């Protein structure tokens, strides 16, 4: 990795990561059929078979109540949580597309006994129809012949325990769907077996290395996905699931963090904060900015950002991470009369810009408190120290190794006078701050 610490804006930039951009959504429809259990009844008294059959009956009956929908500039705040909203909007839209009686009858006659039976919709979307039929095979070969004149208290408990381990999948999936009201936050191991997930991955329409990265990083792909109920038709329960489609792979990405620099003289403060912290990635020559943190996640040397919440910017923004003094691009900052002891956390190291009022120092696990921190915009690396302590709050540093560089520069806070410093502002460009200073002095 590469870490660069800019003194003149009190910022850190971390580059050298590798891109994974979640861009597409693959709709995947599953069905599981149960049979004529509605005409199967236990009337010979209590039994384990009777209780598990009643559990299956109650589960499939309460599954019907869930019927989808309602059961039948500040860049950070603008994009706050919009990716999840867009994802669930696309999910409920494609769910409304596939919740048609002609469509489900067509998909049932199309699937027959061929497992993957890929089909199309009215507007036309790949869906990858798949049925799982192990419980139908069990009930057709064993259970109907086992039941006779509603005698469910048979001596063969092997049939009972095999029915338990078979219907545990259906009971599990309906229990997540009851717990999450049809909108699951993630994918459990019961919704996707590894073979089914691999089959869905191999049929995802994308290139070779895209499929490779889909394969060896499947666990948090399962974390990213989510499944939506469709309904019960005939004896078949049909649901779907959205799989992420990673389209943009192996591009450098960087993350920028900052803390306010406060010029101080004679009890006079002037603090400035860069407001463009977050992720930046490249694709097809264009720059995509992710200001939120929940949308994007690191793993190893790779990053996983969502293009739905991202915004499109130009290349010149990079030049205000290097040459903020002489830049033409007016990238955003914020102004203040008071310092804030908010701590910056680089992926490799850390930064603390604590000021008068609190105490700051560093510590190591093996030895103890190493040294105190002088007041100012201070940077620290995991090589020099293990933990950073401000007053009574302790923060840990990750031990991911890399190489670092510090750009020497006079802080841009010191070029202004706190006397002529303007009122507090939110998300205004640095040239706007300079011209506000010029207007207030004039």
């Amino acid at each position, epitope marked *: 990795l590469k870490e660069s610490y800019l003194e003149e804006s009190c910022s850190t930039i971390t580059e050298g990561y*590798l*891109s994974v951009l979640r*861009t*597409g959504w693959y709709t995947n429809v599953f069905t599981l059929e149960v049979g004529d259990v509605e005409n199967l009844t236990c009337a010979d008294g209590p039994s384990l078979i009777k209780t598990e059959l009643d559990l299956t009956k109650s589960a499939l009956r309460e599954l019907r109540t869930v019927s989808a929908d309602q059961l039948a500039f500040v860049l950070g705040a603008i994009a706050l949580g919009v990716a999840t909203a867009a994802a669930v909007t696309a999910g409920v839209a494609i769910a409304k597309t596939i919740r048609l009686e002609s469509e489900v009858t067509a998909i049932k006659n199309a699937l027959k006994k061929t497992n993957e039976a*890929v089909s*199309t919709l009215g507007n*036309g979307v*790949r869906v990858l129809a798949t049925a799982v039929r192990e419980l139908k095979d069990f009930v057709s070969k064993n259970l109907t012949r086992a039941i006779n004149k509603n005698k469910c208290d048979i001596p063969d408990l092997k049939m009972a325990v095999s029915f338990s381990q078979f219907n545990r999948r259906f009971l599990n999936v309906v229990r997540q769907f009851s717990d999450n009201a049809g909108i699951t936050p993630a994918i459990s191991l019961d919704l996707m077996t590894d073979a089914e997930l691999a089959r869905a991955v*191999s049929n*995802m*329409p*994308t*290139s*070779a*290395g*895209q499929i*490779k*990265l889909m394969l060896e990083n499947r666990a948090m792909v399962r974390r990213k996905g989510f499944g939506i109920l469709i309904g019960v038709y005939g004896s078949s329960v049909i649901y779907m699931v959205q799989l992420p*489609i*990673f*389209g*943009v*792979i*192996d*591009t*450098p990405c960087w993350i920028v963090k900052a803390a306010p620099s406060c010029s101080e003289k004679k009890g006079n403060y002037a603090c400035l904060l860069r407001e463009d912290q977050g992720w930046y990635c*490249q*694709n*097809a*020559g264009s720059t995509v900015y992710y200001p939120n943190e929940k949308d994007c996640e690191t793993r190893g040397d790779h990053v996983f950002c969502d293009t739905a919440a991202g915004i499109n910017v130009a*290349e010149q923004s990079k030049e205000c991470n290097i040459n903020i003094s002489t830049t033409n691009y007016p990238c955003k900052v914020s102004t203040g009369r008071h310092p804030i002891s908010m701590v910056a956390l680089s992926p490799l190291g850390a930064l603390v810009a604590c000021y008068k009022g609190v105490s700051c120092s560093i510590g190591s696990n093996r030895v103890g408190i190493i040294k105190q921190l002088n007041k100012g915009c201070s940077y620290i690396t995991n090589q020099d120290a293990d933990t950073v302590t401000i007053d009574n709050t302790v923060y840990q540093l990750s031990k991911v190794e890399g190489e670092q560089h510090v750009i020497k520069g006079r802080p841009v806070s010191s070029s202004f006078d706190p006397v002529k410093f303007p009122e507090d502002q939110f998300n205004v460009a640095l040239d706007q701050v300079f011209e506000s200073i010029e207007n207030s002095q004039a």
Partner: antibody
Amino acid sequence: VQLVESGGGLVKPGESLRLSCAVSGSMFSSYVMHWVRQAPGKGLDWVSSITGGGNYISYADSVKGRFIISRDNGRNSLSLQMSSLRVDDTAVYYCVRGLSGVMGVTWFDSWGQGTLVTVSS
Amino acid sequence: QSVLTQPPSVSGAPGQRVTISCTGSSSNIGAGFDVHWYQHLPGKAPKVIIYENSHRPSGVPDRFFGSKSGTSASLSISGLQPEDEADYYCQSYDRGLDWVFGGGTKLTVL
């Protein structure tokens, strides 16, 4: 955006040569890149795909194993080692950029002039 | 030996419509993705002529129209001024881990 490459000529069957490609874009590491070939009098045929930095490559089945691909983003250069030849590889080679769409699909565009390579005898 | 098949036997008078048919199989095209077409005049490096089956880039006249449907892709060319004499090629992403092109088709104007 223009681009150039060189490294071919009259080559006996079997030996390994280097094809160096010197594309000069605005910024380099964003683009997947590809090599394609043009046999004289036949149709075009895809040779190789390489993504941004050196980890996810693939080849055509006819040229699997016999070809090595790499790229230096710092030098802004592209490198191919070509080895273990048989005579039907006589063709003109093209470096192509990978300006992608809204998905994993991409189309070749802004093609190079090409470099001619002869293999037989 | 290209799996993408298209007839290399098209020519005619200037002005009228000429149609190119490019057809594969379900693994070739299907409905997941698309076909991109490239033109190649002799004496110069070939350039892309249409991508995403409709998106004309900068520097191409609107005489060129393309479509895809089912597994079959159709080119319609009208207003043949003599300079549009070239070879035409398809591309596809069939799942045999290979980026297969088409068979190539010559187009000349009498």
